[PDB]
UniProtKB/Swiss-Prot annotation, chain A:
Name this protein carries in UniProt: Phenylalanine--tRNA ligase alpha subunit
Source organism phylogeny: Bacteria, Bacillati, Bacillota, Bacilli, Bacillales
Location within or outside the cell: Cytoplasm
Record: residues binding Mg(2+): 54
Quaternary organization: Tetramer of two alpha and two beta subunits.
Gene from which this protein is expressed: pheS
Top-level taxon of the source organism: Bacteria
Native source organism of the sequence: Staphylococcus haemolyticus (strain JCSC1435)
Protein family according to the UniProt entry: Belongs to the class-II aminoacyl-tRNA synthetase family. Phe-tRNA synthetase alpha subunit type 1 subfamily.
Curated annotation (Swiss-Prot), chain C:
Catalytic EC class: ligase
Gene Ontology cellular component annotations, sorted alphabetically: phenylalanine-tRNA ligase complex
Keyword check for Ribosomal protein: no
InterPro entries for the chain: aa-tRNA-synth_II/BPL/LPL, B3/B4_tRNA-bd, DNA-bd_dom_put_sf, Fdx_antiC-bd, Fdx_antiC-bd_sf, NA-bd_OB-fold, Phe-tRNA-ligase_IIc_bsu, Phe-tRNA-ligase_IIc_bsu_bact
Keywords in alphabetical order: Aminoacyl-tRNA synthetase, ATP-binding, Cytoplasm, Ligase, Magnesium, Metal-binding, Nucleotide-binding, Protein biosynthesis, RNA-binding, tRNA-binding
Gene name tied to this protein: pheT
Similarity remark: Belongs to the phenylalanyl-tRNA synthetase beta subunit family. Type 1 subfamily.
Protein name stated in the entry: Phenylalanine--tRNA ligase beta subunit
One protein family per Pfam: tRNA_bind
Reaction catalysed by this enzyme: tRNA(Phe) + L-phenylalanine + ATP = L-phenylalanyl-tRNA(Phe) + AMP + diphosphate + H(+)
Annotated GO biological process: phenylalanyl-tRNA aminoacylation
From Swiss-Prot, chain D:
Organism annotation: Staphylococcus haemolyticus (strain JCSC1435)
Protein name: Phenylalanine--tRNA ligase alpha subunit
Protein's cellular compartments: Cytoplasm
Subunit structure: Tetramer of two alpha and two beta subunits.
Location of this fragment in the whole protein: 107 to 155 of 352
Family affiliation: Belongs to the class-II aminoacyl-tRNA synthetase family. Phe-tRNA synthetase alpha subunit type 1 subfamily.
């Protein structure tokens, strides 16, 4: 229906290295929001849970329409959810051979 | 019944061609090198073709006295203004605007001019790609690494190359790279006078730079016999460059 | 999971509005996705007391004012002596509706049903107060519905929050105030349920815990209004004091409890074991159930008396004439429970809890809550002890972690004392030992098992707003680049697009009778086990069916000019239980005008040869060569279908649609092509081959060859190349004539022969020598000049 | 002709990541439970399996 298709597109990323931190996630998610929605985009990280990651968040971009205080795109919220992200969970690393 | 039989075509007959233009082979070599450097985080920078002798010479460690600034070898317009002889001035100007703050990691493609007669290996206007890296602990091994990537991108990875000590005013130590032997890249560690003049502290920052010539690279890669073919624009030349390329088999 | 504000402050008080509390809860991990306001629409609603009642009914309610009000009411069971719920004149209600001085007789305000005030379906058990509550009292207050409930969409790792006490631990953390668990200590009869009761598990691999207490002499009836509302709030119709006291402590501790009537169990012995082959039993459903190896039952000592986890028995349950009770509190293997419930369509709120896993910490305490309750509210009398089987083990698992590790994962900069405070306010006992904190995680948080879990707790609480922003610096340096295939695909898509074709994106799943359309090999198709939809049931073995549909769709919208391409995968089955072969295809479809400029008389209709021209522009750009030979493909025009080949292998086809397929789809002349793009991409092309422009001019001769009408022009071109020795460069058909000026069944094909020596100029005589040889070869193969 | 809007967004994200040193990787659309789920820390249990 208007908001669900049984076949859709996704882009995932995976970065795995030695000192990867969640601030490194943040910085990267920020380039993503800028790329998609403009150089002035900020992001917002909200606690959440997925099984493969931990800590996990859902990520909003600031609204590229209304500059602050709200419109129908961001649902007078200022923030639009666009990504989920998180630190990969050890079990996933260990199962992969890492 | 007869419909299908009467509407039989000869499917082997010429198709209605929808023709493709070509990208100039000089442009192809340029783009390829840009794409290589994009993926390492560089910026492609574009600047003036007509330059001040400050930027084209002085800022590059070629003082008033230098054989390089000879009016017989470069295309001057006044005593102070000339057709640039290389894309280094864009790299020198970009540096100064950084105001002592690195990293610089830039690639500067474009047309450069040399006061000379044209023949099969010399055009008075040709193309060049220069690069500049300036950052805190840049070392010559870092140069070597980047140069091998360039060679690998241009001529494939098994292609044999040769590094030879050499000398340019604006770098030290310096290097030339041959490909199996033919020279293609010149490069060096940026000379501190050059860092110091464009406002970097050569005690903190080191650099490396390089140039190569797509006209020459292309001639070598394809066996193009006369550099002037690039600037003549015979369609029987240009149309040989329509198709994609891979590494190969 | 539904969580009443009023109710939670039994255990914790956030000293804050329910919105504020939802917000803070959501901002720290658990999403409150809605807030139900049971007081929904409600103004001026008081207790009142019908003093006298006439004759629907004229009532004199004292509503706590100086004088009684008169209310007319014809509701079914209503008299004086009743304390009731009254919405005064000037009040408000759910449904709609707001009520004033009406008249006929004289009616001032409104006495109420439940529903009327706004309860629900399937959850409700005019309204009379069981207790003699002061007239004029706020009515919802007295009704325990002066309340909003928070609805949580909880994730598998937050089972703890499937309980009022677990949720109370969560919120105590968030406001770092205190929570309190509710009364569990009863007063115990001299006797013990050890003397009453026997418990064994014959299947301890599947049942870690089973246990039971006994409470004697109980007064079935109704529960107070609080027990009742809470159950309604929490989504469950309050049935009787003992069905309630179970379901309620479920909600309270998350520990499911079963209620057996002692006297109708059928022994003084309980046995937990697996159901057997085909094993029969009928459950308090009165629906009879035959079982499997893999169901857990309860038995008395040869009686399947309860499907553990899922249901009860007929016979051993609590009827209202029960007066002694065994209360079960067990742990049943999360998945045994999951599969039973599942299959018999028998999901309870108590199986669902066994699915998520149980707080070990809470089993005995939950039991003890329902015994104290049964005491308190079924006047019951409490035996000493429990009969427990099978060991619960430790209630604290210790995890070490360091501040460094926490700052190293998140990238903030917290001290031990910041970190320590978070665990202590989550109620975890922590001890520092040099740089290492040992965190005693309680069994009540079974989702915390590793240091990373503890990292998450810190992250979520201290707050993700705080994490500074950085970019990863990679010490293996590597230039990010499209692969060669990737780059070729982008360039190819630029080429198609540059020729006017729009990029389509179609569904992979088609109907099962469409899945093999245009397929090359018989290859098996891949169907879903449970399609959402007959039209999306099997993976396509071709891109064309949905591209044809998209064309039909467009054309019916009066979009007559359609040019689409797709690169997309098709799917051939690899027999059974293997992954299929996924193959990438380039396909497209074309209909309508290719070039229009009406005012200049230009109108170039798309025909086979322009479709060919697109497939050739593909080959040209990729530096490939394709060849073309007539082919028969079902669904294409038998007369206008070519097979496309690369290195002598078939990779695809190009063809006009069959007139019957086009007619079905109400299309005109329409052309598709499909190409195995994987085959195409396997060809290594290398670098472009530059050849210097020939120094010398070539020579062209034209020939006109009369030949049987069905000889393909490729055949004549091959003969010419075969005889063209060193100088024949290329050959071009420039005219084909079939008409009356020529033997019927013959055509005349005119071909331009181009000759060229790169090393020399061509003498007429050198050309003639070969040209004559070519003519003869042609003549001898039936091609008259 | 047009580029599909979904392809456009996918390409700009690839570009961004390419300039940062990443690889763009493709694999199977029909997949095994192991890789779809287990390898991703959804044991045979789970509510998403
Ligand atoms: O340092 C460079 N680049 C550089 C380094 C070495 C070699 C070459 S090269 O092969 O292209 N070259 C071109 C110029 N040639 C000259 C020019 C004058 C004198 C001597 N030789 C030699 C070959 C380029 N530029 C900078 N811009 C800003 C700061 S540093
Ligand atoms: Zn907005």
């Amino acid at each position: 229906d208007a908001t669900h298709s049984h076949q859709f597109t996704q882009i995932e990323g995976l970065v795995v290295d030695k000192n990867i931190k969640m601030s490194d996630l943040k910085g990267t998610l920020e380039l993503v929001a800028k790329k998609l929605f403009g150089a002035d985009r900020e992001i917002r990280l909200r606690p959440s849970y997925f099984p493969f990651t931990e800590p996990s968040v859902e990520v909003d971009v600031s609204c590229f329409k209304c500059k602050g205080k709200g419109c129908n795109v961001c649902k007078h919220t200022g923030w639009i959810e666009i990504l989920g992200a998180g630190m990969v969970h050890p079990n996933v690393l260990e199962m992969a051979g890492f | 019944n007869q419909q299908l039989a009467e509407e039989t075509i000869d499917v082997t007959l010429p198709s209605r061609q929808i023709s493709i233009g070509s990208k100039h082979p000089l442009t192809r070599t340029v783009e390829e090198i840009e794409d290589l450097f994009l993926g390492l985080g560089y910026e492609i920078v574009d600047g003036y073709e007509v330059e001040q002798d400050y930027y084209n010479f002085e800022a590059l460690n070629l003082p008033k006295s230098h054989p390089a600034r000879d009016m017989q070898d470069s295309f001057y317009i006044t005593d102070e203004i000339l057709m640039r002889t290389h894309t280094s001035p864009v790299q020198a100007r970009t540096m100064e605007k950084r105001n002592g703050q690195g990293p610089v990691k830039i690639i500067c493609p474009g047309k450069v001019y040399r006061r000379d007669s044209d023949d099969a290996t010399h055009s008075h206007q040709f193309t060049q790609i220069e690069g500049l890296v300036v950052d805190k602990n840049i070392k010559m091994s870092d140069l070597k690494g980047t140069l091998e990537l360039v060679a690998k991108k241009l001529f494939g990875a098994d292609r044999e190359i040769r590094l030879r000590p050499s000398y340019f005013p604006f770098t030290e130590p310096s290097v030339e790279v041959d490909v199996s032997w033919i020279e293609i890249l010149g490069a060096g560690m940026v000379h501190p006078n050059v860092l110091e003049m464009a406002g970097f502290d050569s005690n903190e920052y080191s650099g490396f730079a390089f140039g190569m010539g797509p006209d020459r690279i292309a001639m070598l890669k394809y066996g193009i016999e006369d550099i002037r073919y690039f600037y003549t624009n015979d369609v029987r030349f240009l149309e040989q460059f329509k198709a994609v390329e891979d590494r190969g088999e | 999971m539904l969580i009443s504000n009023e109710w939670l402050k039994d255990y914790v008080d956030a000293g804050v509005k329910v919105e504020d509390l939802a917000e803070r809860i959501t901002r720290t991990g658990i999403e409150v996705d809605n807030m139900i306001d049971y007081s929904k629409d409600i103004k001026n609603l008081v207790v009142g007391y019908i003093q006298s009642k006439e004759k629907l009914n004229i009532c004199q309610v004292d509503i706590g004012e100086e004088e009684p009000v008169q209310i007319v009411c014809g509701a079914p069971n209503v008299d004086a002596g009743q304390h009731v719920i009254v919405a005064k004149v000037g009040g408000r209600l759910p449904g709609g509706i707001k009520i004033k001085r009406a008249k006929g007789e004289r009616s001032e305000g409104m006495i109420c049903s439940l529903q009327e005030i706004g309860i629900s379906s399937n959850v409700v058990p005019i309204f009379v107060f069981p207790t003699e509550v002061e007239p004029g009292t706020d009515a919802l207050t007295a009704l325990y519905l002066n309340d909003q409930v928070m609805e949580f969409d909880l994730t598998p790792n937050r089972a703890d929050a499937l309980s009022m006490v677990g949720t109370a631990y969560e919120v105590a953390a968030l406001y770092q105030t205190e929570m309190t668990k509710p009364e569990t200590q009863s007063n115990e009869t001299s006797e013990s349920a050890t003397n009453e009761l026997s418990v064994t598990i014959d299947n301890p691999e599947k049942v870690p815990y089973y246990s039971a207490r006994v409470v004697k002499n109980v007064s079935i009836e109704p529960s107070p209004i609080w027990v009742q509302a809470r159950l309604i709030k929490a989504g469950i119709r309050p049935i009787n004091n003992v069905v309630d006291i179970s379901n309620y402590v479920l909600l309270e501790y998350g520990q499911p409890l079963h209620m057996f009537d002692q006297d109708h169990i059928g022994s003084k012995e309980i046995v937990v074991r697996q159901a057997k082959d085909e094993e029969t039993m009928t459950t308090l459903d009165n629906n009879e159930r035959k079982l499997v190896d893999t169901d857990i039952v309860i038995s008395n000592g040869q009686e399947p008396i309860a499907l553990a986890g899922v249901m009860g028995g007929d016979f051993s349950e609590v009827t209202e004439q029960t007066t002694n009770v065994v209360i079960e509190g067990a742990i049943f293997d999360p998945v045994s429970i999951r599969h039973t419930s599942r299959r018999l369509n028998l999901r309870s709120e108590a199986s669902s809890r066994f699915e998520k896993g149980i707080a070990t910490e809470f089993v005995d305490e939950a039991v003890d809550r329902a015994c104290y309750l049964l005491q308190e509210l079924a006047s019951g009398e409490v035996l000493q002890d429990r009969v427990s089987s099978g060991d619960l083990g430790s209630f604290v698992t210790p995890i070490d972690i360091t501040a460094e590790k926490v700052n190293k994962t998140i990238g903030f900069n917290l001290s031990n004392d910041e970190i320590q405070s978070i665990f202590r306010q989550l109620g975890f006992e922590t001890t520092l030992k040099g740089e290492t904190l040992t965190v005693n995680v309680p069994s009540r948080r079974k989702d915390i098992t590793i240091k990373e879990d503890l990292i998450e707790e810190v992250a979520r609480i201290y707050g993700y707003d705080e994490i500074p922003s950085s970019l990863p610096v990679f010490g293996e340096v590597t230039s990010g680049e499209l692969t060669d295939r990737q780059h070729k695909t982008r360039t190819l898509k630029e080429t198609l697009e540059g020729a006017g074709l729009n990029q389509a994106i179609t569904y992979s799943l088609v109907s099962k009778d469409h899945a093999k359309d245009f397929a090359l090999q018989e290859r098996p198709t891949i169907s879903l086990l449970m399609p959402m939809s007959e039209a999306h049931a099997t993976l396509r073995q071709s891109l064309l069916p949905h591209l044809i549909e998209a064309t039909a769709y467009n054309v019916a919208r009066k979009n007559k000019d359609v040019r689409l391409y797709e690169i997309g995968r098709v799917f051939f089955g690899n027999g059974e239980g293997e992954l299929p072969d996924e193959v990438e295809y380039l396909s497209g479809i074309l209909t309508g005008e290719y070039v229009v400029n009406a005012w200049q008389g230009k109108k170039e209709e798309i025909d086979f040869f322009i479709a060919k021209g697109v497939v050739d522009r593909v080959a040209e750009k990729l530096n490939l060569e394709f060849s073309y030979k007539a082919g028969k493909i079902e669904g294409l025009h038998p007369g206008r279908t070519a097979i496309v080949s690369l290195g002598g292998a078939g990779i695809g086809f190009i063809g006009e649609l069959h007139p019957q397929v086009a007619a079905d789809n109400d299309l005109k002349r329409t052309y598709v092509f499909e190409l195995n793009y994987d085959a195409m991409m396997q060809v290594a092309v290398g670098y472009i081959n530059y050849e210097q422009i020939p120094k010398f001019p070539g020579v062209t001769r034209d020939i006109a060859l009369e030949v049987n009408h069905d000889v393909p022009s490729s055949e004549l071109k091959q003969i010419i190349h075969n005889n063209g020795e060193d100088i024949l460069q290329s050959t071009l058909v420039f005219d084909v004539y079939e008409g009356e000026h020529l033997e019927k069944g013959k055509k005349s094909v005119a071909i331009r022969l181009n000759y060229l020596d790169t090393e020399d100029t061509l003498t007429d005589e050198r050309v003639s020598k070969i040209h004559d040889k070519i003519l003869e070869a042609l003549q001898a193969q039936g091609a008259t000049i």
